[PDB]
């Protein structure tokens, strides 16, 4: 089996700057006058989309900012000026020999400016209170970069009873959103519930709470 090695695995690039992704094979992909290597882009929740076929041919509908080059065992995909809609995972694949094999995929991240999150707190619902468990959720909406610290606090810092989930980079504004869910049974025994958010875009941490 031909091994396809992609580099790098993660590529942070600001909008307007160039990007370059390389793909190496363990066997020559030449047959006749063509190199049998294709480039695909897969956006979150979508099927893969062909960008470049046969090493250097731009697929129908692909903008001219995308180009491919290389021959033999060394191939390169280039974006002359990346745009916000280019976010996704890029794959090379060889088709000179079955089994067809893919590269590991390169996650292209869009480096936009710093953006502070909008913090929201939600107490458990009355419908859920009719059950045995209470869930408090803290929402961090539209921020960048992804690095963010969420901490739960009757002014007692929690540990072990929370879970986080972060969306993929938005195709329009290149921001992230994050949710943190605090799960308790114990809930009716306390009064102060707060989530404190720390992010680069905030001069000081922001706390949203309820009683």
């Amino acid at each position: 089996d031909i091994v396809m090695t992609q580099s790098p695995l993660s590529l942070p690039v600001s909008p307007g700057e160039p990007a370059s992704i390389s793909c190496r094979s363990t066997q020559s992909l030449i047959f006749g006058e063509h190199n049998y290597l294709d480039w695909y882009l897969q956006k979150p929740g979508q099927s893969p989309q062909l960008l470049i076929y046969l090493a250097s041919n731009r697929a129908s509908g692909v903008p001219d900012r995308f180009s491919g080059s290389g021959s033999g065992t060394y191939f390169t995909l280039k974006i002359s000026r990346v745009e916000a809609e280019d976010f996704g995972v890029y794959y090379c694949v060889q088709t000179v020999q079955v089994p067809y094999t893919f590269g590991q995929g390169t996650k292209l991240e869009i480096k936009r400016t710093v953006a502070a999150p909008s913090v929201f707190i939600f107490p458990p619902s009355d419908e859920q209170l009719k059950s045995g468990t209470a869930s408090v959720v803290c929402l961090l909406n539209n921020f960048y970069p992804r690095e963010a610290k969420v901490q739960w606090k009757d002014n007692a810092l929690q540990s072990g009873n929370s879970q986080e989930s972060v969306t993929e980079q938005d195709s329009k504004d290149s921001t992230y959103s994050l949710s943190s869910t605090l799960t308790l049974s114990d809930y009716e025994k306390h009064k102060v519930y707060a989530c404190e958010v720390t992010h680069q875009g905030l001069s000081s941490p922001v706390t949203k709470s309820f009683n």
Binding site: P48, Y100, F102, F122, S125, S131, S135, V137
Partner: protein, 201 residues
């Protein structure tokens, strides 16, 4: 207009069997080879099998040979993939695709929407939906397996909607929330594995 429509996925126990179907419309099905490509959750693409227009075929041996069988019914414009002796590592979204079609000096390529196959011993369970009232959203709690789909006002509201990736709780059940921001401006959950649908205002 070309469309590749997959079906037949879902939950099955290890050692069980599933049969995937890909009905091709608007496309001269009989003249082309077709492929199956799968993607484990959070992982990359892996080629599974190919069948040529003759009916001859090949499989990714190192992972699926002897267990999966690709076939085609040209009279019905349908591609099939029979999955026997299922294992946990077969859990993935499966795509039917032509891969590259290069003829008349133009390159085209068609893919289906994919169908999720989950191989697990856990039982199916429908989700509970709790409102998140003031931004606002819905909490979809304690379901298995993936996936759930969440719309807002029967799919009418789409701007500013963030549906978060599901998180596997310690109970072995998934939970997620789907929010939509309304700064003092002025949900339709579907879990097909359990055949449950809930609307929460």
């Amino acid at each position: 207009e070309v469309q590749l429509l997959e079906s037949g996925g879902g939950l099955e126990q290890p050692g069980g069997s599933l049969r995937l179907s890909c009905v091709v419309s608007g496309f001269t099905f009989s003249n082309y080879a077709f492929n199956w490509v799968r993607q484990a959750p959070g992982k990359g693409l892996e080629w599974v099998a190919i069948i040529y227009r003759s009916g001859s075929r090949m499989y990714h041996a190192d992972s699926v040979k002897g267990r999966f069988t690709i076939s085609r019914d040209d009279s019905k414009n349908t591609l099939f993939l029979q999955m026997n002796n299922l294992r946990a590592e077969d859990t993935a979204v499966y795509y039917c695709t032509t891969l590259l079609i290069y003829e008349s000096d133009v390159g085209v390529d068609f893919w289906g929407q994919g169908t999720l196959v989950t191989v697990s011993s856990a039982s199916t369970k429908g989700p509970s939906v709790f409102p998140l009232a003031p931004a606002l959203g819905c909490l979809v709690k304690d379901y298995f397996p993936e996936p759930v789909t969440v719309s807002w006002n029967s799919g009418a509201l789409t701007s500013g909607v963030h549906t978060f990736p599901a998180v596997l709780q310690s109970s072995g059940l998934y939970s997620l929330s789907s929010v939509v921001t309304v700064p003092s401006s002025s949900c339709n959950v579907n879990h097909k594995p359990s055949n449950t649908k809930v609307d929460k205002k």
